[PDB]
């Protein structure tokens, strides 16, 4: 059959992966003990997209966690579902990275990449033929980029024929508490834009915004933020796991959404956010679903796409709809703003429709869009890079690590080329 393998890197990964796997376990109704309490024939049918199976019924995940901080994995094992993780899979190290990209890229990897590659290949021989691997890392997170660049670079030529889903949190345009974060981000994004095929870029500022918009619980927990993002990402995966009239393949999605080799960075979009009164006070229907769905506020990734224009938009739907209403909704929004698409490519919409709704809610969806609303993000990070390489402050750590400034120059050149490339294809 066809299957996927999950990689959990950095403490952003150590966060997400735990929340995400327990979300999917609740979706397929697996108890924390790991023994199925049958409710859904079909989820028994397609639990095999992610979960292998062992004598006694237990449902192992096809994921591997990786980090350098023993305390964090101790905490996640102290979490409710740590028993749904394997001692053999627990690959780790003796040292703390110090959150230095070069430390993660040249020295500490030399005693862990071998083990992690061994793990991934034993799992690959276990499975039949993967559609590919997905990764949860942070592009500015200390250990995440250092480990991830190396492992993705190796696995690329290891398996040149698969789907490398990459998922990263964008550094806040206002708050990081990490001061070498611009340096780490630029260094990482060089190899990222070289190698990857698809990347979702998310930030926490819009998560806080949406918390004060529709969560309306004032002080949130980062775990709840993880709930939201994991909901998004499960949703984008839901195409494979279920029957119904749709087109599951992520490869379908890629050819449907990618106009050129050097476009990878896309911005998630979620479906109804329901709050205190709205549970009694919403008419859950296709029209309002579309309305709130394409709202410049309910998007959560980077920034308002207003200043730019949308290139391609794909919508996954979930529920007992009919395609006529989605067709007319798409036409209506097309005419509403026929100014903010591009005559370059007409009818830039893609639709998938699954009949197996999520639990606790009936009519829902997930959105993905590639627009020209990323120039400002990598712009800001580029000019911060300029301002701080101006005097090469703090450079001593990386120089002693043993990297060189020509790498900085080449990476910034590639980012400048990205800026231009985005600019001309829409302006």
């Amino acid at each position: 059959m066809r299957e996927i393998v999950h990689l959990q890197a950095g403490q952003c990964g150590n966060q997400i992966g735990a929340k995400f796997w327990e979300v999917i376990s609740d979706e397929h109704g697996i108890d924390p003990t790991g023994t199925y309490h049958g409710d859904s024939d079909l989820q028994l049918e397609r639990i095999n997209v992610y979960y292998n199976e062992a004598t006694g019924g237990k449902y192992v995940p096809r994921a591997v966690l990786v980090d350098l901080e023993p305390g964090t994995m101790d905490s996640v094992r102290s979490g409710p579902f740590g028993q749904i993780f394997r001692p053999d899979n627990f690959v780790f190290g003796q040292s703390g990275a110090g959150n230095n990209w070069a430390k993660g890229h040249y020295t500490e990897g030399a005693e862990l990449v071998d083990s992690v590659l061994d793990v991934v290949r034993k799992e690959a021989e276990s499975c039949d033929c993967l559609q590919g691997f997905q990764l949860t890392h942070s592009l500015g997170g200390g250990t995440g980029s250092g480990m991830g660049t190396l492992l993705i670079s190796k696995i690329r030529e290891e398996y040149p024929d698969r789907i490398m889903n990459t998922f990263s949190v964008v550094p806040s345009p206002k708050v990081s508490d990490t001061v070498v974060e611009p340096y780490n981000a630029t260094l990482s994004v060089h190899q990222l834009v070289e190698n990857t095929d698809e990347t979702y870029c998310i930030d926490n500022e819009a998560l806080y915004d949406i918390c004060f918009r529709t969560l309306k619980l004032t002080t949130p927990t980062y775990g709840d933020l993880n709930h939201l993002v994991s909901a998004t990402m499960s949703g984008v995966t839901t195409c494979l796991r279920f029957p119904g009239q749709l087109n599951a393949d992520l490869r379908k999605l890629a050819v449907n959404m990618v106009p050129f080799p050097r476009l990878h960075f896309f911005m998630p979009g979620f479906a109804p956010l329901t709050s205190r009164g709205s549970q009694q006070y919403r008419a859950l229907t296709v029209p309002e679903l579309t309305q709130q769905m394409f709202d410049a506020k309910n998007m959560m990734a980077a920034c308002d796409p207003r200043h730019g224009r949308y290139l391609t938009v794909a919508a996954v739907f979930r529920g007992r709809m009919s395609m006529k209403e989605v067709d007319e909704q798409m036409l209506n929004v097309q005419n509403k703003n026929s100014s903010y698409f591009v005559e370059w490519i007409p009818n830039n919409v893609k639709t998938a429709v699954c009949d197996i709704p999520p639990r606790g809610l009936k009519m829902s969806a997930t959105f993905i869009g590639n627009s020209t609303a990323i120039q400002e993000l990598f712009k800001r990070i580029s000019e911060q890079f300029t301002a701080m390489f101006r005097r090469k402050a703090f450079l001593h750590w990386y120089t002693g690590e043993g990297m060189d400034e020509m790498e900085f120059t080449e990476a910034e050149s590639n980012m400048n080329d990205l800026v231009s490339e985005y600019q001309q294809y829409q302006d």
Partner: protein, 99 residues
């Protein structure tokens, strides 16, 4: 009722309750079922002061089916038609967590 409640006269420029939810069929059956819902919820909130799987059937399944039901591979050495049909009953005994 008056004239008809089972149907509300085709091309009804007036509206009905229960527009969302069960919908996506022909008209008259929708009218019947929707008004049935409109008196169901009616008495349900009335409730005056109460405090006061064809995928498998008898003879198993066709060859070349995918989707892991529990077991198989752990047990083997039988015709797949049998294998499926015997799993159809031992899914009640030892892997009885199938419902």
């Amino acid at each position: 009722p008056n004239l008809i409640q089972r149907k509300a006269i085709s091309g009804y420029a007036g509206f009905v309750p229960r527009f969302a939810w069960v919908m996506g069929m022909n008209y008259r059956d929708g009218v019947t079922q929707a008004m049935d819902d409109f008196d169901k919820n009616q008495f349900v909130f009335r409730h005056p002061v109460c405090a006061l799987t064809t995928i498998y059937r008898s003879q198993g399944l066709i060859p070349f089916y995918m989707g892991f039901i529990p077991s198989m591979q752990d047990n083997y050495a039988l015709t797949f038609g049998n294998s499926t049909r015997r799993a159809y009953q031992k899914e009640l005994d030892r892997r009885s967590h199938t419902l």
